[PDB]
Design an enzyme around this catalytic site. Structure first.
Site, mmCIF file in Angstrom:
data_model
loop_
_atom_site.group_PDB
_atom_site.id
_atom_site.type_symbol
_atom_site.label_atom_id
_atom_site.label_comp_id
_atom_site.label_asym_id
_atom_site.label_seq_id
_atom_site.Cartn_x
_atom_site.Cartn_y
_atom_site.Cartn_z
ATOM 1 N N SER A 109 0.802 -1.249 0.000
ATOM 2 C CA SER A 109 0.000 0.000 0.000
ATOM 3 C C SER A 109 0.822 1.281 0.000
ATOM 4 O O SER A 109 0.318 2.338 -0.396
ATOM 5 C CB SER A 109 -1.013 0.044 1.128
ATOM 6 O OG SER A 109 -0.388 0.383 2.346
ATOM 7 N N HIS A 160 2.132 4.874 4.209
ATOM 8 C CA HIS A 160 1.168 5.638 3.408
ATOM 9 C C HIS A 160 1.695 7.045 3.126
ATOM 10 O O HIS A 160 1.897 7.415 1.969
ATOM 11 C CB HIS A 160 -0.197 5.720 4.086
ATOM 12 C CG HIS A 160 -0.859 4.402 4.318
ATOM 13 N ND1 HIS A 160 -2.115 4.300 4.882
ATOM 14 C CD2 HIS A 160 -0.463 3.133 4.056
ATOM 15 C CE1 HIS A 160 -2.455 3.026 4.974
ATOM 16 N NE2 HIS A 160 -1.482 2.298 4.456
#
EC number: 3.4.21.105
Lengths: 178, 4
Positions: A109, A160
């Site tokens: 991610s 992230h």
């Protein structure tokens, strides 16, 4: 789509499948970011953390985004570009996740948030490239970030933001050389 | 463990 998009989806499935046969922890022992400086020369770990997922929705949701955004980068900007976006971002996002919370993390991610950052900024500053991210996703991305800041779950918030940042920086640079 |  492309060879790089596909090679990376097969890697994560192969690793996911090993985590199911061997157990997460066993696979983490070898693929996770170095937890002990002695291991720092085991170079694959700066990358391999990206291949590990810990549930099926984890992998699917990530391969989904990766397929959609990665394939678009490969399709329009070429396989070399996608490789470089992947490598720098797995490395830098891994590096910042480790500082945030130590070395027990994994998932794609970080690389995805870099892709979302690249695809959005590049599509905004250089629409000539032929990629762009729809606003519906740049809002879902934003919700996604902040939903990690509040945790209802266990997200890699350093990954992230670091990945995101990398993807905006790379995209900025690339939309000057355009 | 954390999920990137």
């Amino acid at each position: 789509a492309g060879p790089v998009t596909w090679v990376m989806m097969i890697a994560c499935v192969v690793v996911f499948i090993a985590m199911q046969i061997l157990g997460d922890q066993e696979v983490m022992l070898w693929l996770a970011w170095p937890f002990d400086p002695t291991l720092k020369f085991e170079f694959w770990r700066y990358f391999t953390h990206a291949l590990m997922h810990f549930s099926l929705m984890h992998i699917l949701f990530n391969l989904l985004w990766w397929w959609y955004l990665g394939g678009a980068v490969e399709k329009r900007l070429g396989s070399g570009k996608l490789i470089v976006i992947t490598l720098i971002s797995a490395l830098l996002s891994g590096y910042v996740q480790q500082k945030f919370s130590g070395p027990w993390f994994g998932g794609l991610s970080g690389v995805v948030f870099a892709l979302m950052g690249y695809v959005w900024l590049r599509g905004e500053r250089d629409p000539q490239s032929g990629i762009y991210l729809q606003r519906g996703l740049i809002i879902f991305a934003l919700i996604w970030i902040v939903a990690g800041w509040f945790d209802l779950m266990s997200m890699a918030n350093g990954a992230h933001i670091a990945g995101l940042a990398v993807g905006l920086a790379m995209a900025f640079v690339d939309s000057l050389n355009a | 463990v954390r999920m990137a």
